[model samples]
Target: MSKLELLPAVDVRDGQAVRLVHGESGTETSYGSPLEAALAWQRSGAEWLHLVDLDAAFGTGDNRALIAEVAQAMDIKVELSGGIRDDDTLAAALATGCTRVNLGTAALETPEWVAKVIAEHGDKIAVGLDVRGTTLRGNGWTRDGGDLYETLDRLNKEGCARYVVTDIAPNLELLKNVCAATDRPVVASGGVSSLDDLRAIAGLVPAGVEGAIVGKALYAKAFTLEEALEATS
Candidate 1:
């Protein structure tokens, strides 16, 4: 089996590192400069960075320039997400030099376009399956998309490269089911608030879960980055 990766998340909102409860927009906990946060993670030995623009996803607005700068500054691979809709946003995302861009709303809302992009970019793109219970949420995990399984089946047929799975709260049963149904790597997110939570996710490695996007847990000092890496590894 492949060693599980620890992807530390840097959610950008108004050009600062922030975290939202259950992916809520107004309920944000700011952590300061996004670029500084990315560099800190890079210096901490993270192999990959998970960058999200909450403002863009929530329709408040997009943060193309800021996200691009952070991506360019990162030494390791960066996987970007948020408001990546048309050719303009897509072009901006690519210009950032991110290793991959995880399209959330676009994949769920515009299936045809997503398939075309997947065909063109291959593994350079990833689909975010952010959800609440069995229902997949889009437009920043605030709006409903469709049944998770239904969307997953469609995405599989479209030749999607991977999935960034999220649930408002921890749902192991759902996580297990997602891992079982898809051959693509599943990077678990949301409600990972402790070392035990990390271990529980790591246990799913045998079930084809490739990584976990951890933010609050890491920033809150639930455990050090080394501990996270070791637990997941």
Candidate 2:
């Protein structure tokens, strides 16, 4: 089997790298410049980066130029997220040369447009399935979208490339549940607290999880990126 892919997260808010609890807007704790954090992760042996723009996700504003710079700086693959709702935004995100762009609000609020993009972009487009209970949330988890399974069903029919699933409490069961619902690969996100958490996620790779995004743990010094890579290995 292939090694489990680890995507070190660099969530940008107001020009700083930050982490939020339950994907909320006001719960941000700044780390530093997004580019610097991304570079640190790359230097630590990460093969992929999970880059987010919280302001765009919350509909407040965007960090288009900054996000582009970080994506350009990364020598590794970048999975870009946040504020990607329409053609213009999607075009801007793709222009950053990211490996893929994940859609959250668009998948829930504008199914038709998302379907069109999925058909147009194929594997280049992914959906962010952030949920609280079985209900999905959008606009940075501030607005309720719809039932989890229902959205998954529609996306499955539309030929979605993959899903980036985020929840407050991350676990193997959640990853398994998402895998069971669809054949598409799942990218686990949020609630990763330690090396053990990453190991647990690595164990789920055989069950259809293709990647895991680690943020708070890496930034809080709960564990180093090198340790995370070793644990997964």
Every candidate's lDDT: 0.84, 0.88
Query: Which 10 consecutive residues of model 1 have the lowest summed lDDT?
Result: 136-145
Q: TM-score, each model?
A: 0.94, 0.96
lDDT of 1 by residue, 1-233 (tens): 64778899999888889877885678898888988888988888899999998888888886778888888888899998888877788888888888999898898778899999999999889998877777877874455578888999999998998998888535667778998889998888777888898888878888988888899987888888878777776
- Residue 37, candidate 1: alpha-carbon lDDT: 85
RMSD of each: 1.7, 1.5
List ranges where model 2 is wrong by over 4 Å: 140-142
| Predicted model with the maximum lDDT | 2
Runs of candidate 1 exceeding 4 Å displacement: 140-142
lDDT of 2: 0.88
lDDT of 1 at 152: 94
Give residue 37's error in model 1 in angstroms.
Answer: 1.1
